[PDB]
Specification:
Chain A is built from one helix and three strands, in the order βββα. By secondary structure, chain A is of the alpha+beta class. Chain A starts with a strand and ends in an 11-residue tail after the last helix. With 373 residues, chain B is of the alpha+beta class. In chain B, 26% of the residues lie in helices and 31% in strands. The two termini of chain B are 39 Å apart. Bound molecules: 2-acetamido-2-deoxy-beta-D-glucopyranose (NAG) (3 copies). The site of one 2-acetamido-2-deoxy-beta-D-glucopyranose has 2 residues of chain B, from α9. Chains A, E, F: This is Fusion glycoprotein F2.
Chain lengths: 82, 373, 373, 373, 82, 82
């Protein structure tokens, strides 16, 4: 059998049969972590191009942390009422 | 249709409560310790929630052990690009997770690859306290698990970034589901309008679940693979099993079948799993065709059906529908259209969210006044 | 409003049938062969669908001819970064396509740049079996073509990755379209409530198409550039051309005009293409202002209109609306509000999805009982 | 519920008018000049709009001053990867902004990080002509400012790329808001059906604003932090302050309270800010449990409430709800259910969008015929 | 003429005229391909930093294939019924 | 006090009190610019791998401009009517 269908002429409706459920009932809460570092604006003359790229990516990491830090406070949303 | 009938709840409410606990007093160090020896570890919260913890990406041991000697000077004399590329690569994920949270105000769905990769996710599933079979199901439908999951930003306390990934649990598996497709049923009189309609409002997914039937009014919310129907019970109503009586007998006493009434003589088609329902009214061209052969059936006024076997397309007016090409048998159950049982005058034409008996009470009420007066 | 009246169909059903064919028996080699000499080639499927095939990104000839000598050892003695960067660059697209399919469970819309680039897309359009003019239209509206397209993941059979990009065909071009904006029409009596309302429910886009008119009930679904209206006929109803009678004469016998009734005396504005409709009721402040000059018109209770000429803003209560600044002439067609023709008692106040005659039948029915009793 | 009652407007209409001005005659050079000395500058448009302009990313001075000597040959003899990486990095943002506009047909929301970074956005806020307090609010809720903002692609005239970022202004701050949660109220008779229902339709957010109350019918549209409710007045209706009477007294003469009628005896729960409303009908299992202790309350048929204090979960049939764990006091205001005041026969069972008096008129009308006949 | 509008006072409705259609009627199905390779976990000592980046990106490619392979089975969705 | 709630038994409704508004009233239009260059397809033999990567990224920049240029005409949408 598997997928089968029946059309009811009298009601203008059709039922598709043969399916199996996988209904979400519960939830599994996992804590995903990223271990980061706490360097401080180091100061160096280092005019080297290889260093300035490392300086450029290090600023990106530092700003990301500051962004995520500002992202906290307050607690989540979640746009309810439907 | 019946979507407005659903209740309300907060999906992230459980994952939010894990954030509350992760803040106090402190608990961040409790998990930092546990994730020093291994990249993955089970941890029991003071709350007592046994939560699987993962150290995906360790930027500390890379910046401290590979970038720190260069900047704790002086002069940045030594440097190499094979390290600039390695860092750009390593950092990117944090940058991409930060991007995602910045637009989704700290709560993402579906859970992205940057949030949790396939290898990380498949490992998370395989380390969950769930059935051997339940592990297989989730692993074989990761694409769905991602769409049904949430990623909640939590905190950056002491040297650590924590976000909660909230994954589905399927408490109901392998129970029979069925999809009810409904279309408008109208009288087919040769007049301008003056026709009466009726439509079953109960369209949606139905699953047997704990002795009752879980009804998904907006069938658009469920994800389907093959046989498999993935639903969220929050988007359901839990009805008596007698709701299935409306199919075989809409006039049954056991259940008051949800219908709506109109004088809206409008043409349309509904593409089902194995065919097509055609509601053909007025001067509309309603047809079913095969690619090579052309028109194979011309629908008359009224509500009809055509099976997908040898039909690729259905055209209702200026609209073309592609029929689903799934292998399966369909059954035409001949019956007198329910709308013919109604006297047009004295029939209540504007019931938006009614049922059979509601309509029948209204019919008597109106009928009585004509007879008694 | 009338959105619920629409039929149903599967958009990806045609592209899905191409995946079924791409699997058997095998057909993957048939296209691998055809795409060895050129990066683009037309191929006829056993099904007989003539399908344009594209070899965007060839990772085989890069990994096999530039990375394979290094790893088929031994010792990886020779290496260069100019190759690590070139590989990271080349691989990225596959990585970004894989990202996209992992969240969208193998079906994306709009079709992204990684899925199909502008140069690839513009070439695909220019190699389609379509009109010279139709090629120009699609090329000049790629942003829309992308939003109306689907990308279906298919298979990775033997050494190949295949995903189907399903692009729109515009079978109806340069036919006249019009947008109908409706707002509630209410009595303006000095009492607390006790007012009766009426609203045209037929709001949406309308296009002449094959002798009938294609009606888009949710005008929110159409994409518009300038004059140009881009629609999907699946989001339409196909009505008789007499539907346009409701504009000039809502009482015409030829068509039963779709209206809804209420006692919902609520203030609002609808921003049209060239002006603003103001439904002003109760103690509400309804105004139209110019930036520099301030208030230029104060709306009285009832339904009115103001043209965009010299008006930048419309304020209804605590809500501010920016009017569209498009050049075009508008016409005020003075007429007695249709609601004044109704006796408040004996007028059916809660018709959700009605029409003129439905309302008129109900009026007589109720009227008769008072007179006959 | 009442969402359909809202007016219409174009959100990007103000930002679109800035594009019209940015085109003519030319004005692009006026801003190119102003952005030569600084990376950020205030500019007054011929229109006279004082607009803050930003030179984020200057690709000209990088390609012209670092890449141009290499390609204005001859022979590309000199080259270095530290420049290929620097260029790939610099170019990416333009590539990522171009990606975004290609799918969103030149209008994005929320405004992405690539469109405007946090440091750029926080600087834009701090350079706006707004209150000291208003600057703090926006800076502390950037995640929201991004979701409420639009990015409109404008033009690439002479050597320049311009896109308008349209940011919210909060003209109403620190005024009291409240959320009204409603659920169906039904008779609890022991019969199959034959029950009558009533539901308050006025559910949504409410804020005191300019002497009236701004009503957000789709509470799903508002973003909330803590105490703070962020709304768009376009998604509101502006009602008299007497709308709050419906809470304490739904029968008050001052305001006609919006209700809907049914015979839809369906079980459900609504999760509120501090508890849960349970609408329990038929043979449904309705419960409130604590994690450790299990079932702490069994709901009887009818509409009830349970406070979040010591309750983690509420189960209505096969559906589980997590209650919000926010600290706050709740008050049960005991009262006779409004539905008991209605005679089942002669009570109008299918009012979709009604009010108390509408229902009361219908009751008299029907009642009179029985008595007068 | 081009864009023109008429406001009907009696019905509280306005029609915006002067537009031209581009209604989606059909579909054009194109097969987009990516020609990939079938290398097998090669084993080498190669401790070189240039090689390990190539090893890192090669793992990314290999995993992507495995992901896409797992992404197939079963056939697409598409969340119908509206 | 802060967040407080009242459940009305007679109406099956509950009001959550104690919130403060931040209602969007106006708009602030800012012009964000990117200063670009107008080089022309330079022609060189330069078969060097470092150059071809620069040639590859320069084509990406050039195409992006052409894309954005084509993206203009006509003026924005915005899918109205609700
Ligand atoms: C109305 O229908 C009911 C069945 O529900 C029937 O018992 C009754 O006789 C009808 N009206 C009458 C009593 O005339
Ligand atoms: C009711 O209206 C109809 C027009 O549709 C009219 O013919 C009829 O006379 C009216 N009622 C009567 C007959 O009193
Ligand atoms: C109907 O209700 C009204 C109150 O709105 C009342 O004045 C009237 O007496 C009632 N019907 C009658 C008059 O019998």
């Amino acid at each position: 059998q598997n997928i089968t269908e029946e059309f009811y002429q009298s009601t203008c409706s059709a039922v598709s049969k043969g399916y199996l459920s996988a209904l979400r009932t519960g939830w599994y809460t996992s804590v995903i972590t990223i271990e980061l570092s706490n360097i401080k604006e180091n100061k160096c003359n280092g005019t080297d191009a290889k260093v300035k790229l490392i300086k450029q990516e290090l600023d990106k990491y530092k700003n990301a942390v500051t962004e995520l830090q500002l992202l906290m406070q307050s607690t989540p949303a979640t746009n309810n009422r439907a | 249709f019946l979507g407005f009938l659903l209740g309300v709840g907060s999906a992230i409410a459980s994952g939010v409560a894990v954030c509350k606990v992760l803040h106090l007093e402190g608990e961040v160090n409790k998990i930092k310790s546990a994730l020093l020896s291994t990249n993955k570890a089970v941890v029991s919260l003071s709350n007592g929630v046994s939560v699987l913890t993962f150290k995906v990406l360790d930027l500390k041991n890379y910046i401290d052990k590979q970038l720190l000697p260069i900047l704790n000077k002086q002069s940045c004399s030594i440097s190499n690009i094979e390290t600039v590329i390695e860092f750009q690569q390593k950092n990117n994920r944090l940058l991409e997770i930060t991007r995602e949270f910045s637009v989704n105000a700290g709560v993402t769905t579906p859970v992205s690859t940057y949030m949790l990769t396939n290898s990380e996710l498949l490992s998370l599933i395989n380390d969950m306290p769930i059935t051997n079979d339940q592990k297989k199901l989730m692993s074989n439908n990761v694409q769905i698990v991602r769409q049904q999951s949430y990623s909640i930003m939590c905190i950056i306390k002491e040297e650590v970034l924590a976000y909660v990934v909230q994954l589905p649990l399927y408490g109901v598996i392998d129970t029979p589901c069925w999809k009810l497709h409904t279309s408008p049923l109208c009288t087919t009189n040769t007049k301008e309008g003056s026709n009466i309609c009726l439509t079953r409002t109960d369209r949606g997914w139905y699953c047997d679940n704990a002795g009752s039937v879980s009804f998904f009014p907006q069938a658009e919310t469920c994800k389907v693979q093959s046989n498999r129907v993935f639903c969220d019970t929050m988007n359901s109503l839990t009805l008596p099993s007698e709701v299935n009586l409306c199919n075989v007998d809409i006039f049954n006493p056991k259940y008051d079948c949800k219908i709506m009434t109109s004088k809206t003589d409008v043409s349309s088609s509904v593409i089902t799993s194995l065919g097509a329902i055609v509601s053909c009214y007025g001067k509309t061209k309603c047809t079913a065709s095969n690619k090579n052969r052309g028109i194979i059936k011309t629908f008359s006024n009224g509500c009809d059906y055509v099976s997908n076997k040898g039909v690729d397309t259905v055209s209702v007016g200026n609209t073309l529908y592609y029929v689903n090409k799934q292998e399966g048998k369909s059954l035409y159950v001949k019956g007198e259209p329910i709308i013919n049982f109604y006297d047009p005058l004295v029939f209540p034409s504007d019931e938006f969210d009614a049922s059979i008996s509601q309509v029948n009470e209204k019919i008597n009420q109106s009928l009585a006044f004509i007879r008694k007066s």
